[PDB]
Each structure stands twice: as structure tokens, then as C-alpha cells.
Amino acid sequence: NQALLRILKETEFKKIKVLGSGAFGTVYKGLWIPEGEKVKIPVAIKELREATSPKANKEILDEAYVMASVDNPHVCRLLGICLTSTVQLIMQLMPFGCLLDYVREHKDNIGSQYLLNWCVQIAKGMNYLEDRRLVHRDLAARNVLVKTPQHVKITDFGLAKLLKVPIKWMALESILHRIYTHQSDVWSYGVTVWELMTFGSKPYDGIPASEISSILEKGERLPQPPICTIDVYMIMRKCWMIDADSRPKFRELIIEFSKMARDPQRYLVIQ
Ligand SMILES: *CCC(=O)Nc1cc(Nc2nccc(-c3cn(C)c4ccccc34)n2)c(OC)cc1N(C)CCN(C)C
Ligand SMILES: O=C(Nc1nccs1)[C@@H](c1cc(F)ccc1O)N1Cc2ccccc2C1=O
Q1: Is 245 a catalytic residue?
Q2: Which of 27, 138, 139 has most ligand 1 atoms within 8 Å of its beta carbon, as the pocket-test mutant?
Q3: Long-range contacts of 34-39 (CB under 8 A, 24+ apart)
Q4: Closest ligand to Cα 24
Q5: Are 237 and 247 in contact (CB under 8 A)?
């Protein structure tokens, strides 16, 4: 469906300032000024480094059409694309940033209701992606954007396969065998929840990435966050089982966290 994706000209968007760096390009804050329109729309612009992919623009545009057809409240959608010597991707701006920086900036004012609400919404977005046969591969708190404090969306899924490796978020079968499934995303979701329950701590802080596979093979896992009760830590612990098919499904994670969101004081102990 070609109509869903905007083909932009260089004069239809302007970069204002730099938001951050991705794995393959810089993300800017900018304005989208559609031709023959009286609108100037705040957007996020990601410009890929030139000649970083082997695929030509014809194949990259075909892949971008898929990213422009997702229809879910908790999943980001590609708005436009500009095909010059470099590819430039345009998306709606999320004014509050990524969820990792948000829980760090607002650590003192975040209660149990917010945290369990985020776990449900992320599992809903991931469950929609599994239904659409899309594998994320890079699910982390840095890739969960905040449109408003209680409305989050998942971004940058399928980026590796559509075109330096995030070891501390990957399932063990992905580290050892380069296998990426929807159950492989369940592992990363478990780490993402761990980032939120610790209010943005770094997983395996101080441990080199080359030792991570040895640590997981020994049986070590991320420690229990202090605010988590035993019922909450066991779920994220089950996301880290060696057998990917013994991990919980996203449909089950939605139900488990939704029930806890009914009685948030019973499951998260926050001062
Ligand atoms: C933790 C990363 C982050 O996203 N930080 C911020 C994001 C903002 N808005 C926004 N909107 C849509 C898409 C993105 C985006 C997507 N990708 C892949 C990104 C990579 C790096 C950075 C942004 C990316 N971002 C935003 O708008 C106000 C602000 C921030 N932060 C918190 C400001 C940090 N920076 C200025 C130092
Ligand atoms: O554009 C993206 N992120 C951005 N952040 C700031 C501005 S754009 C990212 C992406 C966006 C989205 F809504 C959903 C899934 C995604 O994978 N995509 C899409 C795409 C298509 C073809 C080649 C590269 C990319 C690529 O990197």
C-alpha cells in the first residue's frame, strides 16, 4: 500500500537540533513542512550513514512501506522517507523522549501504577508485532518512546534485518547462534522491565559484553530489583529461561501485568 508512506523532498523537512545517535544514523528534531500546505509539523528525522547498507534504494523503499503500515497505539509508524545518496526517515515527534531517560529524570515521582501500566502497554505493542510476524531484535527501554507519560510506543523494530550488537539485551540463543524469534524478544522485554523497575540502571553494569554469555551459561541473571515483590521478579526471571519456548508469551504477559495493575501496591513496594 504505497499511499501510507510519504515520499519527501529535501525542502519539505528541516532539521532543528540533534536528539541522539542510533546504531546507523543520527536522529534530529525537526519540522515537516508539506508542500503547498500551511502546516509545520514537529517530527523526528533519522539520517542513515551513507553506504552503510548493501541494499539499493529500490529495496529499502520496499521495506519502508512495511514500516508505514503498522496500525497499533503502542507501535511507532514510519511517516516519510527521502531517497538521496542517504536515506532519511521521518516520524512523529515524541516530546517526552525515550522511556529510559524519563524514568531517570522522574525517579522520585513515579509510583507503582505508572510502572505496571508501562509493562502492559509494551507487551501490547510487542504482541501486535508478533501477530504481524515482525521480530524486533533490539527491544530496550531506549527504544520505548513517550508520547505522553501514560502512552508509550515501541520503535526501531526490524532495523537490522532491513539494512555494534546489543549483547546485554539479547537472549542467549541470539548471542550464541544469531537466532531471533518472538520468544527471543520476550527475553529482551524482561530486561526492559528490569530497567524500569530499577529506574534506569544499566544491566550487568561494569561487566564486559564478551563475558555476558559465560555469565548466563553459569546461571547468573539480573538481580531482583528492590521494589519488586517475588511475584513480579519470577515473571521476568521466566523471560530469561534457556528454552525460548518455555518463556511466557506476550499474550500471557499482558494478562499477568494487567491483573497486577489492578492492585499495584500489592506487587511493587515504592517509598
Ligand atoms: C533514549 C532515547 C531518546 O529517544 N531520547 C529523546 C527522544 C526524543 N524524541 C524522539 N521522538 C521520536 C523518535 C526519537 C528517536 C528514535 N531513535 C531511534 C532515536 C535515537 C536517539 C535519539 C532519539 C531517537 N526520539 C526527544 O524529543 C524531545 C528527546 C529525547 N531526549 C530525552 C533528549 C536527549 N538528548 C537531547 C540529549
Ligand atoms: O525510521 C525509524 N526510526 C526513526 N527515529 C527517528 C526518526 S525515524 C525506523 C523505524 C521506524 C518506525 F516507525 C517503525 C519501525 C522502524 O524500524 N526505521 C524504519 C526504516 C525503513 C527503512 C530503512 C531504515 C529504517 C529505520 O531505521
Answers
A1: no
A2: 27
A3: 35/9, 35/11
A4: 2
A5: no
Q: Which atom of ligand 2 is nearest to the CA of 22?
A: 5
Q: Give me the CATH number covering residue 44.
A: 3.30.200.20
Phi-psi bin for 224: left (phi > 0), alpha (psi -120 to 50), beta?
beta
The H or E element that residue 215 is part of is helix 212-218
Pocket of ligand 1 (CB under 6 A): 19-22, 27, 29, 44, 46, 91, 93-95, 97-98, 100-101, 142, 145, 155-156
User: Atom 2 of ligand 2 has which residue's CA nearest to it?
Assistant: 156
Residue located via cell numbers 497505539: 73
The cell for 170 is 539479547
Q: Give the CATH number for residue 220.
A: 1.10.510.10
CA of 70 to the centre of ligand 1 (A): 21
- Total structural domains in the chain? 2
> Same domain, yes or no, for 206 and 106?
yes
Please state, as a whole number, how many other Cβ atoms lie within 10 Å of the Cβ of residue 263.
11
| CA-based nearest residue to 75, from 67, 83, 64, 87 | 67
Contact 28, 91 (CB under 8 A): no
Range of the domain at 132: 97-266
Residue linked to cell 513496594: 269
